[PDB]
Amino acid sequence: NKTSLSVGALNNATSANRASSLAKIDAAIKTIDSQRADLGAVQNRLAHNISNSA
Amino acid sequence: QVRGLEVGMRNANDAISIAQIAEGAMQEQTNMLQRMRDLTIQSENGANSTADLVSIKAEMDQLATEIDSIGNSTAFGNTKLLTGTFSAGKVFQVGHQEGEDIKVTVKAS
Amino acid sequence: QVRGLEVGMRNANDAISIAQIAEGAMQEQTNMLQRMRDLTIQSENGANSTADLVSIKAEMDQLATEIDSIGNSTAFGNTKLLTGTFSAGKVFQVGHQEGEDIKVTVKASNKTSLSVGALNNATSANRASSLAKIDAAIKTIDSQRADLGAVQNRLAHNISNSA
Amino acid sequence: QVRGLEVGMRNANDAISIAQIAEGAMQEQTNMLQRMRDLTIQSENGANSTADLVSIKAEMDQLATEIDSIGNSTAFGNTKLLTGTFSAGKVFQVGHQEGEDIKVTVKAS
Amino acid sequence: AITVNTNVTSMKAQKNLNTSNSGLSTSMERLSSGLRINSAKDDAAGLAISNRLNS
Amino acid sequence: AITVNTNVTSMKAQKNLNTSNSGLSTSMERLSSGLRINSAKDDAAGLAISNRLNS
Amino acid sequence: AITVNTNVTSMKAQKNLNTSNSGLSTSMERLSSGLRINSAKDDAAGLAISNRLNS
Amino acid sequence: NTQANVADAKSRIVDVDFAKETSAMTKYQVLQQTGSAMLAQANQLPQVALSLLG
Amino acid sequence: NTQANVADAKSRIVDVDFAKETSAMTKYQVLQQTGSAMLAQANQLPQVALSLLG
């Protein structure tokens, strides 16, 4: 969620404000990407159990 | 990267337009300055008189007023470009990552 | 609302046409009034004669008759638009609910209205008085045209918004 | 959940339409305001006269009447959207449980 | 979103064509006569000033 | 860069034609009369000096 | 290699058309005025030298 | 003299500039043909409904 | 001069590029016919149940 992904306070007024905001968004996409890969592996894993059990 | 570049492209097209307007205004300041040179050369006749020199100054005086007027008017929508707010070059980002910036500096004129 | 607006659109297109016809007729009244100004200026020569001034008046007299004739003729099918029936602005409804109305006012414009109909050019005082009334006549028509133009500029924006 | 979402989908399609109509009306108010700017600039000639300034005002006066007229007319069937009844944002529910709401605020114009 | 009773795409398309047709028409009559202020649609103050200049 | 709403090429072209037309006009009136200083557009000091020489 | 989501052939084709259109535009304005150095796009040193020659 | 100068002032207000007007006239001709092709093609959008079995 | 340059700046923001737009329009036309054929054919998937004796 927004507090988890270190977003919720993003300003764009000063020079330093925009530079800090850009890094956090990039880190946010990486965290979600790793989460999706973990969930995909499990359901690839679960599909092979069903075939073996059948 | 694909979407980052697309926004970066429009970011640089904006910088081109700002430089285009400032360049156009300085051309008109150059032409009026050339006319002031001719009046100074013309004001050096020995056949003139005290009243004649005053009339030439009344012309030079109004030409200098417009050099002020263009300087205080040239703007991009609502931002004045020749009054020193671009004395320390502003920054446009043309890439998709930090540090890919271009700096445009316009000194006050 | 959908069907209400569609009838309202045609309601405003009708108002545009009425304002269009009245404006067109006032243009021709302006041109003939300008010709009367030249005749009054031309009638001030000291080389003219009593018989010469009569011929100039015989021309001014017929031009004033047409200003009457256009005023009593300009009509929208069968409704006369310049004879005062639009003195107190009529109402067109451009919305689908009560109170969404536009008012078009056309003041009467004919020879008695514009203070013309008795214009002589014999004496010195006669020409001076005639010149002032013609100048006041052009001003009155000019203000009327501006009022009608504003309404049809106003009506054009309603149609675009309603579409 | 399946039936709850289906009603929630139609709930949000309704909110889109309300925002669509209000946005459309404000566009026409913007164009007429731009024409008022030109008349004010045009009304600054030194070659005009007292009678000329009155004619320009008679045009500005009617343009302001329609800005009133659009504001009091724009409606969704029978609910006026630009007269302040949406000053404190109204609520649409887009989920199947309590608290899944979206707020749309339209200030009076 | 596949309907066979209303075509809003057509409705928006129709309006744009009407605007482009009206602009073409008004340009031809200005070119055919040579006057910017044909009617009172245009500058309301311009025609008033022109009348006195014409005088 | 293919637009159908603004033609800046036309805008620049129009300005150049106006400048060339104005220069042609001012040359004809100088030739039709025979005076460089027709109005006060030209040498402001020249007309003042010429007035005393005319006297 | 049969895709329906990206047309890179179109992307390359679009760029070439933009370059040819921009070259056509810049040639017309040079011809409409008669000056090679219209703006500071061109020879930066040329305009500086020309200013002193103009003086 | 004064007649010529008033003619100058009067033409700037009521007279058209053909350079301005010709560009606009050609400007709208293209938009008309663009509008006609878009409208004709947008009219046959609902024929997709016939593909899904009447 | 300044009017022309502002017209440049204003068109880059609000005006369409037909090269960009025409490709997208043709791009989606193909996807529509692809989507209609897939949907019509996916609708008769459950008819397999009739093969296994009602």
XYZ file of C-alpha atoms in Angstrom:
708
model
C 0.000 0.000 0.000
C 1.080 3.629 -0.119
C 2.735 3.795 3.315
C 4.431 0.443 2.681
C 5.921 1.496 -0.674
C 7.339 4.712 0.855
C 4.950 7.020 -0.981
C 2.387 9.441 0.394
C 4.616 12.488 0.762
C 5.876 13.424 -2.710
C 6.599 17.071 -3.501
C 7.999 18.641 -6.669
C 8.809 22.243 -5.703
C 12.564 22.390 -5.087
C 15.405 20.763 -7.025
C 16.098 18.281 -4.226
C 12.408 17.423 -3.869
C 12.088 16.021 -7.392
C 15.337 14.038 -7.195
C 14.242 12.295 -3.993
C 10.778 11.556 -5.399
C 12.148 9.876 -8.529
C 14.289 7.391 -6.590
C 11.421 6.223 -4.374
C 9.125 5.517 -7.329
C 11.844 3.459 -9.023
C 12.364 1.477 -5.820
C 8.591 0.982 -5.629
C 8.421 -0.721 -9.032
C 11.274 -3.058 -8.088
C 9.524 -4.179 -4.898
C 6.273 -4.982 -6.718
C 8.196 -6.767 -9.476
C 9.878 -9.123 -7.006
C 6.529 -9.816 -5.331
C 4.914 -10.827 -8.625
C 7.774 -13.207 -9.417
C 7.374 -14.896 -6.031
C 3.645 -15.435 -6.576
C 4.168 -16.720 -10.112
C 6.652 -19.353 -8.958
C 4.201 -20.765 -6.407
C 1.400 -21.200 -8.941
C 3.835 -22.756 -11.397
C 4.750 -24.986 -8.462
C 1.112 -25.775 -7.622
C 0.242 -26.720 -11.208
C 2.737 -29.596 -11.133
C 1.253 -31.002 -7.909
C -2.198 -31.294 -9.497
C -0.884 -33.164 -12.535
C 1.108 -35.520 -10.311
C -1.858 -36.066 -7.986
C -4.164 -36.798 -10.926
C 12.595 4.063 -20.915
C 10.093 4.280 -23.784
C 7.641 6.452 -21.858
C 10.476 8.296 -20.133
C 11.967 9.373 -23.451
C 8.587 10.485 -24.805
C 8.144 12.945 -21.939
C 11.793 13.926 -22.346
C 11.202 14.761 -26.005
C 8.446 17.229 -25.122
C 10.680 18.585 -22.362
C 13.297 19.645 -24.934
C 10.794 21.009 -27.461
C 9.788 23.447 -24.706
C 13.396 24.599 -24.255
C 13.713 25.221 -28.004
C 10.697 27.533 -27.951
C 12.053 29.590 -25.040
C 15.387 30.090 -26.805
C 13.503 30.917 -30.006
C 11.535 33.785 -28.449
C 14.504 35.369 -26.665
C 16.578 35.294 -29.853
C 13.801 36.983 -31.817
C 13.525 39.885 -29.386
C 17.271 40.586 -29.366
C 17.208 41.042 -33.143
C 14.953 44.084 -32.830
C 17.178 45.572 -30.126
C 20.112 45.267 -32.532
C 18.369 47.212 -35.311
C 17.444 50.127 -33.041
C 20.990 50.274 -31.668
C 22.288 50.618 -35.230
C 20.014 53.618 -35.786
C 21.452 55.237 -32.649
C 24.928 54.912 -34.178
C 23.846 56.845 -37.273
C 22.316 59.637 -35.186
C 25.539 60.012 -33.189
C 27.512 60.210 -36.435
C 24.915 62.617 -37.851
C 25.077 64.726 -34.677
C 28.715 65.647 -35.346
C 28.158 68.201 -38.134
C 29.707 71.613 -37.645
C 26.779 73.164 -39.499
C 24.245 72.120 -36.856
C 23.089 74.394 -34.040
C 22.107 74.100 -30.399
C 18.447 73.677 -31.361
C 19.353 71.042 -33.966
C 21.194 68.847 -31.465
C 18.156 68.845 -29.166
C 15.911 67.417 -31.901
C 18.341 64.557 -32.549
C 18.451 63.749 -28.832
C 14.642 63.680 -28.676
C 14.840 60.807 -31.184
C 17.644 58.900 -29.444
C 15.747 59.249 -26.169
C 12.643 57.416 -27.408
C 14.630 54.611 -29.050
C 16.265 53.822 -25.699
C 12.808 53.658 -24.110
C 11.796 50.745 -26.358
C 14.976 48.811 -25.593
C 13.661 49.008 -22.042
C 10.152 48.136 -23.238
C 11.127 44.984 -25.140
C 13.283 43.838 -22.228
C 10.392 44.087 -19.778
C 7.771 42.587 -22.115
C 9.244 39.504 -23.814
C 7.558 36.593 -22.057
C 6.562 32.948 -22.501
C 2.882 33.116 -21.646
C 3.464 34.779 -18.289
C 7.197 34.348 -17.496
C 9.510 37.241 -18.392
C 12.642 35.916 -20.098
C 14.924 38.973 -20.372
C 14.702 40.417 -16.847
C 17.279 38.203 -15.132
C 15.157 35.292 -13.932
C 17.241 33.216 -16.350
C 20.526 34.764 -15.195
C 21.462 31.489 -13.454
C 20.517 28.940 -16.098
C 17.318 26.987 -15.581
C 17.182 23.225 -16.021
C 15.302 20.942 -18.414
C 15.475 17.138 -18.179
C 15.748 15.393 -21.553
C 16.444 11.826 -20.398
C 14.587 9.282 -18.307
C 17.015 9.266 -15.359
C 18.473 11.795 -12.951
C 21.340 13.916 -14.224
C 20.255 14.048 -17.887
C 19.670 17.800 -17.886
C 20.227 20.777 -20.174
C 20.831 24.300 -18.877
C 19.654 27.456 -20.653
C 21.088 30.786 -19.473
C 19.730 34.160 -20.628
C 21.413 37.218 -19.160
C 19.394 40.357 -18.488
C 19.244 42.749 -21.444
C -33.216 16.908 -21.731
C -32.013 15.415 -25.027
C -35.247 16.167 -26.877
C -35.688 19.427 -24.981
C -32.325 20.724 -26.167
C -33.008 19.697 -29.771
C -36.125 21.870 -29.896
C -34.191 24.581 -28.067
C -31.500 24.527 -30.748
C -34.043 25.240 -33.486
C -35.571 27.896 -31.238
C -32.297 29.864 -31.256
C -31.599 29.376 -34.969
C -34.890 31.217 -35.531
C -33.740 34.154 -33.385
C -30.494 34.393 -35.372
C -32.424 34.736 -38.627
C -34.635 37.532 -37.273
C -31.603 39.509 -36.100
C -29.928 38.817 -39.447
C -32.741 40.365 -41.502
C -33.119 43.486 -39.351
C -29.374 44.140 -39.476
C -29.348 43.844 -43.260
C -32.094 46.424 -43.717
C -30.426 49.004 -41.462
C -27.309 48.897 -43.641
C -29.227 50.290 -46.611
C -30.736 53.045 -44.467
C -27.201 54.057 -43.481
C -26.024 54.427 -47.089
C -28.949 56.656 -48.084
C -28.435 58.827 -45.001
C -24.821 59.375 -46.069
C -25.998 60.616 -49.468
C -28.282 63.117 -47.719
C -25.232 64.506 -45.905
C -23.463 65.179 -49.207
C -26.501 66.961 -50.653
C -26.718 69.227 -47.598
C -23.022 70.049 -47.961
C -23.510 70.518 -51.714
C -26.534 72.755 -51.085
C -24.368 75.380 -49.364
C -22.724 76.890 -52.465
C -23.017 80.633 -52.890
C -23.134 80.156 -56.656
C -26.431 78.253 -56.551
C -29.817 79.885 -57.103
C -33.354 79.556 -55.802
C -34.224 77.141 -58.614
C -31.073 75.099 -57.946
C -31.919 74.538 -54.280
C -35.356 73.200 -55.233
C -33.841 70.479 -57.441
C -31.585 69.294 -54.610
C -34.563 69.122 -52.249
C -36.529 67.060 -54.782
C -33.760 64.453 -54.434
C -33.541 64.553 -50.631
C -37.324 64.233 -50.480
C -37.431 60.899 -52.322
C -34.550 59.403 -50.330
C -36.480 60.014 -47.101
C -39.483 58.231 -48.621
C -37.515 54.980 -48.962
C -36.276 55.140 -45.374
C -39.985 55.034 -44.601
C -40.501 52.295 -47.198
C -37.824 49.939 -45.860
C -39.061 50.475 -42.307
C -42.603 49.444 -43.212
C -41.597 46.512 -45.442
C -38.864 44.504 -43.693
C -40.649 41.379 -42.487
C -40.082 37.739 -41.536
C -42.627 36.029 -43.750
C -45.522 38.138 -42.507
C -44.313 39.853 -39.290
C -42.958 43.400 -39.618
C -39.739 43.748 -37.619
C -38.961 47.491 -37.738
C -42.348 49.009 -36.857
C -42.161 48.727 -33.067
C -43.682 45.303 -32.444
C -40.222 44.378 -31.149
C -39.905 47.560 -29.077
C -40.340 45.520 -25.871
C -38.067 42.560 -26.551
C -39.701 39.287 -27.514
C -38.699 36.006 -25.902
C -37.143 32.804 -27.243
C -36.561 29.734 -25.055
C -33.222 28.009 -25.670
C -33.219 25.526 -22.775
C -35.441 22.658 -21.709
C -36.784 24.290 -18.528
C -38.603 27.476 -17.597
C -36.514 30.624 -17.334
C -33.930 29.716 -19.999
C -34.903 32.552 -22.330
C -33.223 35.069 -24.621
C -34.686 38.501 -25.353
C -34.317 40.309 -28.685
C -35.242 44.005 -28.801
C -35.532 45.975 -32.057
C -36.534 49.610 -31.715
C -38.662 51.251 -34.391
C -36.645 52.821 -37.209
C -38.433 54.887 -39.862
C -38.476 58.481 -41.061
C -40.700 59.922 -38.317
C -38.756 57.967 -35.688
C -35.346 59.249 -36.831
C -36.581 62.877 -36.774
C -36.526 63.294 -40.546
C -39.350 64.092 -42.935
C -39.172 67.879 -42.788
C -35.747 68.924 -44.087
C -35.377 72.260 -45.873
C -32.265 73.946 -47.257
C -33.367 77.501 -48.102
C -32.167 79.722 -45.252
C -28.869 79.668 -43.358
C -30.519 78.308 -40.212
C -32.402 75.643 -42.172
C -29.253 73.882 -43.380
C -27.545 74.007 -39.974
C -30.515 72.345 -38.269
C -30.789 69.692 -40.992
C -27.138 68.657 -40.681
C -27.366 67.973 -36.939
C -30.416 65.717 -37.256
C -28.810 63.536 -39.934
C -25.701 63.086 -37.781
C -27.871 62.097 -34.820
C -29.716 59.671 -37.108
C -26.546 57.755 -37.996
C -25.606 57.459 -34.318
C -28.984 55.959 -33.402
C -28.788 53.319 -36.144
C -25.182 52.540 -35.210
C -26.108 51.779 -31.599
C -29.001 49.595 -32.763
C -26.726 47.488 -34.970
C -24.274 46.953 -32.111
C -27.087 45.733 -29.858
C -28.266 43.206 -32.451
C -24.731 41.995 -33.137
C -24.093 41.280 -29.461
C -27.195 39.084 -29.195
C -26.236 36.908 -32.161
C -22.692 36.632 -30.842
C -24.402 35.617 -27.606
C -26.691 33.098 -29.330
C -23.827 31.412 -31.192
C -22.206 30.371 -27.907
C -25.438 28.782 -26.640
C -25.629 26.487 -29.675
C -22.049 25.277 -29.259
C -22.617 24.652 -25.551
C -25.920 22.874 -26.207
C -24.324 20.669 -28.871
C -18.589 -9.913 -4.264
C -19.428 -10.725 -7.895
C -22.821 -9.015 -7.791
C -21.490 -6.297 -5.499
C -18.804 -5.324 -7.995
C -21.269 -5.301 -10.898
C -23.416 -2.679 -9.175
C -20.230 -0.862 -8.183
C -19.143 -0.699 -11.820
C -22.352 1.079 -12.825
C -21.952 3.313 -9.777
C -18.644 4.656 -11.134
C -19.835 4.989 -14.736
C -22.413 7.431 -13.349
C -19.697 9.516 -11.667
C -17.747 9.695 -14.939
C -20.762 11.146 -16.742
C -21.308 13.848 -14.108
C -17.671 14.944 -14.320
C -17.917 14.831 -18.116
C -20.831 17.283 -18.289
C -19.371 19.795 -15.826
C -16.053 19.829 -17.685
C -17.800 20.476 -20.993
C -19.671 23.507 -19.682
C -16.556 25.138 -18.210
C -14.894 25.057 -21.632
C -17.494 27.437 -23.052
C -17.098 29.788 -20.088
C -13.369 29.926 -20.841
C -13.879 30.975 -24.472
C -16.236 33.833 -23.583
C -13.845 35.061 -20.889
C -11.090 35.248 -23.510
C -13.287 37.468 -25.684
C -13.798 39.802 -22.714
C -10.013 40.175 -22.465
C -9.800 41.340 -26.082
C -12.573 43.900 -25.587
C -10.794 45.347 -22.543
C -7.581 45.609 -24.562
C -9.551 47.064 -27.484
C -11.265 49.545 -25.149
C -7.953 51.267 -24.375
C -7.535 53.203 -27.645
C -6.988 56.931 -27.354
C -8.897 57.422 -30.600
C -12.170 56.126 -29.149
C -14.880 58.382 -27.735
C -17.408 58.333 -24.920
C -20.047 56.865 -27.240
C -17.594 54.228 -28.495
C -16.826 52.927 -25.004
C -20.543 52.456 -24.317
C -20.952 50.151 -27.331
C -18.073 47.947 -26.169
C -19.607 47.694 -22.698
C -22.963 46.676 -24.192
C -21.128 43.642 -25.611
C -19.216 42.762 -22.435
C -22.467 43.046 -20.488
C -24.261 40.335 -22.476
C -21.302 37.938 -22.384
C -21.347 38.044 -18.574
C -25.063 37.215 -18.648
C -24.393 33.869 -20.355
C -21.686 32.931 -17.858
C -24.540 33.254 -15.383
C -26.863 31.365 -17.736
C -24.599 28.342 -18.226
C -23.927 28.181 -14.489
C -27.630 28.007 -13.665
C -28.541 25.591 -16.479
C -25.954 22.789 -16.593
C -27.765 19.804 -15.106
C -27.815 16.000 -15.066
C -31.430 15.336 -15.952
C -32.794 17.521 -13.170
C -29.870 18.166 -10.764
C -27.922 21.409 -11.227
C -24.186 20.714 -11.044
C -22.586 24.188 -11.017
C -24.688 25.981 -8.386
C -22.908 24.747 -5.257
C -24.832 21.575 -4.442
C -21.540 19.799 -5.157
C -19.503 22.273 -3.097
C -18.980 19.607 -0.404
C -18.122 16.573 -2.513
C -20.813 13.955 -2.985
C -20.101 10.259 -2.540
C -20.215 7.275 -4.897
C -19.551 3.707 -3.721
C -17.426 1.658 -6.129
C -16.785 -1.428 -3.982
C -18.964 -4.061 -2.364
C -18.259 -3.065 1.255
C -18.557 0.048 3.385
C -15.824 2.644 3.016
C -15.046 2.007 -0.671
C -16.171 5.451 -1.808
C -15.095 8.141 -4.262
C -15.768 11.841 -3.702
C -16.464 14.327 -6.500
C -16.332 18.039 -5.639
C -17.515 20.770 -8.026
C -17.260 24.324 -6.743
C -19.842 26.904 -7.771
C -18.964 28.763 -10.972
C -19.448 -0.912 -24.341
C -20.870 -2.175 -27.637
C -24.169 -0.419 -28.294
C -26.439 -0.207 -31.330
C -28.780 2.551 -30.135
C -26.493 5.587 -29.682
C -23.316 6.567 -31.554
C -21.691 9.318 -29.501
C -18.612 9.099 -31.717
C -20.837 10.235 -34.586
C -22.315 13.029 -32.463
C -18.882 14.482 -31.703
C -17.778 13.985 -35.310
C -20.851 15.806 -36.638
C -20.172 18.897 -34.523
C -16.590 19.215 -35.753
C -17.700 19.040 -39.390
C -20.282 21.781 -38.815
C -17.657 24.094 -37.316
C -15.249 23.554 -40.216
C -18.008 24.123 -42.787
C -19.138 27.375 -41.156
C -15.578 28.716 -41.073
C -15.117 27.940 -44.757
C -18.344 29.755 -45.641
C -17.501 32.944 -43.748
C -14.064 33.132 -45.374
C -15.487 33.030 -48.907
C -17.863 35.963 -48.403
C -15.091 38.089 -46.907
C -12.969 37.273 -49.960
C -15.815 37.796 -52.442
C -16.503 41.357 -51.234
C -13.263 42.529 -49.630
C -14.590 43.663 -46.263
C -13.787 42.210 -42.863
C -16.832 43.766 -41.180
C -19.627 42.476 -43.404
C -22.234 42.275 -40.642
C -22.461 43.152 -36.957
C -21.126 39.692 -36.094
C -17.631 41.222 -36.154
C -16.204 44.270 -34.380
C -19.180 46.166 -32.986
C -17.027 49.236 -32.359
C -15.301 48.977 -35.735
C -18.424 49.604 -37.796
C -19.401 52.585 -35.644
C -15.967 54.167 -36.086
C -15.950 53.408 -39.813
C -19.276 55.197 -40.280
C -17.845 58.476 -38.983
C -14.676 57.991 -41.032
C -16.871 57.342 -44.065
C -18.669 60.624 -43.377
C 5.495 17.616 -36.773
C 2.521 17.417 -39.138
C -0.169 19.797 -37.916
C -3.389 21.090 -39.457
C -4.196 23.836 -36.941
C -1.247 26.261 -37.227
C 0.944 27.116 -40.232
C 3.939 28.999 -38.848
C 5.590 28.803 -42.264
C 2.716 30.934 -43.559
C 3.067 33.354 -40.640
C 6.736 34.000 -41.411
C 6.008 34.190 -45.141
C 3.240 36.756 -44.600
C 5.528 39.106 -42.671
C 8.178 39.109 -45.395
C 5.605 39.981 -48.061
C 4.316 42.895 -45.974
C 7.824 44.327 -45.604
C 8.520 44.094 -49.342
C 5.168 45.701 -50.198
C 5.724 48.617 -47.813
C 9.180 49.295 -49.248
C 7.793 49.342 -52.776
C 5.082 51.822 -51.778
C 7.441 54.291 -50.106
C 9.762 54.287 -53.124
C 6.980 55.257 -55.541
C 5.890 58.339 -53.588
C 9.477 59.566 -53.316
C 9.787 59.154 -57.087
C 6.386 60.708 -57.833
C 7.222 63.948 -55.983
C 11.015 64.158 -55.963
C 11.610 64.670 -52.252
C 13.400 62.346 -49.865
C 11.889 63.942 -46.752
C 8.182 63.691 -47.536
C 7.066 63.277 -43.923
C 8.685 63.288 -40.491
C 9.330 59.550 -40.831
C 12.718 60.454 -42.334
C 15.496 62.719 -41.060
C 14.006 64.697 -38.186
C 16.923 67.136 -38.253
C 16.893 67.397 -42.044
C 13.461 68.999 -42.278
C 14.305 71.508 -39.545
C 17.490 72.561 -41.346
C 15.701 72.709 -44.700
C 13.079 75.081 -43.295
C 15.714 77.680 -42.410
C 17.447 77.176 -45.758
C 14.073 77.630 -47.447
C 13.652 80.908 -45.562
C 8.033 -11.896 -36.236
C 4.384 -11.007 -36.855
C 3.248 -8.584 -34.165
C 0.148 -6.432 -33.750
C 1.295 -4.291 -30.813
C 4.335 -2.401 -32.167
C 5.110 -1.214 -35.710
C 8.787 -0.258 -35.720
C 8.639 0.116 -39.498
C 6.165 2.951 -38.924
C 8.395 4.486 -36.248
C 11.370 4.678 -38.612
C 9.146 5.897 -41.449
C 7.690 8.678 -39.286
C 11.126 10.064 -38.417
C 12.194 10.290 -42.057
C 9.038 12.209 -42.984
C 9.627 14.696 -40.160
C 13.175 15.383 -41.356
C 12.056 15.962 -44.950
C 9.230 18.268 -43.838
C 11.530 20.374 -41.653
C 14.037 20.794 -44.483
C 11.300 21.937 -46.845
C 10.073 24.515 -44.325
C 13.486 26.067 -43.697
C 14.139 26.414 -47.431
C 10.942 28.399 -48.029
C 11.685 31.046 -45.393
C 15.204 31.550 -46.740
C 13.692 32.028 -50.200
C 10.858 34.266 -48.975
C 13.248 36.766 -47.345
C 16.564 36.326 -49.149
C 18.851 35.806 -46.167
C 20.827 32.700 -45.296
C 21.331 33.714 -41.657
C 17.741 34.288 -40.561
C 18.274 33.194 -36.958
C 21.181 32.091 -34.784
C 20.597 28.497 -35.900
C 23.074 29.162 -38.725
C 26.617 30.546 -38.670
C 27.134 31.980 -35.197
C 30.248 33.836 -36.344
C 28.615 35.021 -39.564
C 25.992 37.182 -37.875
C 28.587 38.766 -35.588
C 30.799 39.680 -38.549
C 27.821 40.944 -40.552
C 26.821 43.303 -37.740
C 30.157 45.126 -37.905
C 30.029 45.175 -41.708
C 26.511 46.589 -41.458
C 27.848 49.327 -39.181
C -3.709 65.270 -47.795
C -6.104 64.559 -44.930
C -8.363 62.508 -47.213
C -5.556 60.054 -47.984
C -4.625 59.542 -44.331
C -8.237 58.905 -43.285
C -8.479 56.320 -46.071
C -5.472 54.608 -44.478
C -7.156 54.538 -41.074
C -10.476 53.300 -42.457
C -8.995 50.398 -44.439
C -7.099 48.909 -41.485
C -10.426 48.430 -39.693
C -12.871 47.119 -42.313
C -10.702 45.620 -45.074
C -9.421 42.053 -45.284
C -5.805 40.991 -45.710
C -5.765 38.357 -48.437
C -2.601 36.795 -47.012
C -4.477 36.213 -43.761
C -7.713 35.166 -45.461
C -6.288 32.837 -48.117
C -4.397 30.808 -45.516
C -7.557 30.396 -43.434
C -9.617 29.348 -46.464
C -7.121 26.648 -47.423
C -6.828 25.868 -43.715
C -10.491 24.809 -43.438
C -10.636 22.958 -46.771
C -8.315 20.283 -45.388
C -10.339 20.054 -42.176
C -13.521 19.467 -44.189
C -12.128 16.459 -46.053
C -10.645 15.163 -42.803
C -14.011 15.564 -41.087
C -15.918 13.796 -43.858
C -13.650 10.738 -43.838
C -13.799 10.491 -40.042
C -17.593 10.790 -39.980
C -18.156 8.221 -42.736
C -15.844 5.731 -41.035
C -17.317 6.379 -37.585
C -20.796 5.608 -38.926
C -19.950 1.936 -39.540
C -18.663 1.329 -36.000
C -21.887 -0.467 -34.909
C -21.387 -3.153 -37.578
C -19.138 -4.964 -35.088
C -22.345 -6.151 -33.399
C -23.154 -8.242 -36.489
C -19.944 -10.251 -36.085
C -21.065 -11.677 -32.721
C -23.809 -13.799 -34.274
C -26.501 -11.219 -35.012
C 7.880 37.879 -34.744
C 6.919 36.899 -31.199
C 3.426 35.881 -32.336
C 4.834 33.257 -34.707
C 7.121 31.714 -32.086
C 4.327 31.457 -29.502
C 2.195 29.713 -32.132
C 5.023 27.182 -32.465
C 5.078 26.563 -28.717
C 1.296 26.278 -28.449
C 0.911 23.746 -31.275
C 3.452 21.280 -29.860
C 1.277 20.941 -26.751
C -2.327 20.744 -27.988
C -2.099 19.627 -31.631
C -2.041 16.056 -32.921
C 0.581 14.541 -35.203
C -1.296 12.688 -37.928
C 1.631 10.315 -38.461
C 1.318 9.277 -34.821
C -2.483 9.239 -34.843
C -3.063 7.428 -38.142
C -0.827 4.534 -37.104
C -2.712 4.161 -33.818
C -6.101 4.250 -35.559
C -5.108 1.488 -37.973
C -3.414 -0.217 -35.028
C -6.705 -0.679 -33.139
C -8.802 -1.603 -36.187
C -6.910 -4.887 -36.496
C -7.273 -5.554 -32.768
C -11.046 -5.085 -33.023
C -11.481 -7.734 -35.719
C -9.110 -10.019 -33.821
C -11.118 -9.490 -30.639
C -14.453 -10.179 -32.331
C -13.313 -13.485 -33.838
C -11.817 -14.627 -30.530
C -14.956 -13.718 -28.577
C -17.344 -15.400 -31.021
C -15.270 -18.584 -31.026
C -14.823 -18.564 -27.246
C -18.600 -18.386 -26.800
C -19.122 -21.884 -28.240
C -16.606 -23.549 -25.904
C -19.355 -24.989 -23.628
C -20.827 -26.983 -26.534
C -18.275 -29.701 -25.737
C -20.581 -30.710 -22.872
C -23.202 -31.811 -25.418
C -20.810 -34.368 -26.915
C -20.649 -36.367 -23.662
C -24.249 -37.550 -23.942
C -26.197 -34.454 -22.910
